[PDB]
Amino acid sequence: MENFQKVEKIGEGTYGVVYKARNKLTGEVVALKKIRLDTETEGVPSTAIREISLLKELNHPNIVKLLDVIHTENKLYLVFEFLHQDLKKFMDASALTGIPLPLIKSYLFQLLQGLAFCHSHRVLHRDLKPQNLLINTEGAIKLADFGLARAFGVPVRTYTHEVVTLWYRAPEILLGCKYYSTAVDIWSLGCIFAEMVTRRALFPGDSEIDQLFRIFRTLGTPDEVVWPGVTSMPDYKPSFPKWARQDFSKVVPPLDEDGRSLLSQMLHYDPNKRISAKAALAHPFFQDVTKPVPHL
Amino acid sequence: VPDYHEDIHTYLREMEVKCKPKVGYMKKQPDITNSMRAILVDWLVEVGEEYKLQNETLHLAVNYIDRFLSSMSVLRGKLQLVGTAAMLLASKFEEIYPPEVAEFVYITDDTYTKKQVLRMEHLVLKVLTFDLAAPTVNQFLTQYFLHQQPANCKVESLAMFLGELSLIDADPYLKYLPSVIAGAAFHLALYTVTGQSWPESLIRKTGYTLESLKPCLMDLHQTYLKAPQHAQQSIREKYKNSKYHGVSLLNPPETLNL
């Protein structure tokens, strides 16, 4: 730990703070995630334990790279490759101008490649929001923050319900579903795609019921035809208002016929019908795909 | 049932080989024996039943312990500390609600301190280099169950029962990979309950013929027949209960005809 000089606190992650640091000997700029520890209590947090072991399995250009684990008695540091900023800051900085469609297409293509790699190595991310997606100066975007992530089984068991930042949380979690899997990460990515297109969060609810209703008002209220089994779900209420489906030309105006086809497959109600990250990579929306550099 | 099943199967088949313990590590342990490990594993079964822990958590902790004892000499009076920290780590990894350190200390009846349990947690993470996402017989069995035409609960409970019996005995079961033990366990469970055999669709998925499962399957048939005589009995007791369809009460087949 004495080879690193700290440059600046660059945030608070899902748990513990992230610093910019440099290696005093090689010059390498790194991100340090400091995790606080206890004897007198619980040990290494289950959240750090998951993050580090899953990250060891997840070496991919579109997944943040773990360089080292500095495991003391008193402190635990994770050493990461350094990335310039997160997608939430990028989105705010370009809120008036907009993100160019070739770069939205690029970024989504890459997030889906990272995600396909995760899913096909039995990992659920469970926290895809723009602040957990990092970008560099060269046109690359990467999944980060595997603190809430989980290694899953085939078929799945019941996992933690307390899952995904509200605005990016899939309807099957909201409705109290017993099982959920990889389709919840695709939901969040659908939400982010739309957020990039329109510059505002697609479904900015402020409680679980408000989140559901915002979903219902946009996509229509789901029924047995559209989603076999819905009306039989734990937190489903047959008194839910029945809204009609909003037309995507209105929902996400800037997007062409291919982009709207893909988004509606990422926001499918039925988790089993919802497009997979591998299938999504094969969608006509990506035929033209380039690797533009962010115009910051 | 998705689009990732084969990818995951193929990856777990690579990982099981990278995550295996050294087969002969016990011959190089100067203070501990197989029968001591068998007493430890049987106890972890009880700990799991006491805390309502997943079977997966049990399989993981046994993997952590066997890989840890692959590179580390442990005296007999420190063995339960290895096992406790391993079950603590497995719970942290796999459980929705892992039990607390203080609860782990209570189940050792104050044999170790909290400081010790947590210092050992740090050493197991060091020795395992944080590589905790290991394949288990469990993970393979659940995939294999999707091939039962149609779903039989007693078969699944007996397969689970047999895969768990294999944890207790490092001689012979350290010789075999999780996917092989699971094939054998599934075949034997199927054969016992219904008379059917290792299915063609699984021969194709796994690359394993019934012949190739023969060595592990001869062993496991023996372990099954002698189960009611065995020194360790926590698995049989657990599998008598009605959530397991009382499958440890079923009579093994006297003959396999293989």
Ligand SMILES: N=C1NC(=O)/C(=C/c2ccc(-c3ccc(C(=O)O)cc3)o2)S1
């Ligand atoms: N919550 C996290 N989980 C990780 O793995 C992280 C790794 C990481 C590497 C680089 C950064 C990073 C994050 C934010 C910023 C900015 O807001 O400018 C700049 C860099 O995070 S952050």
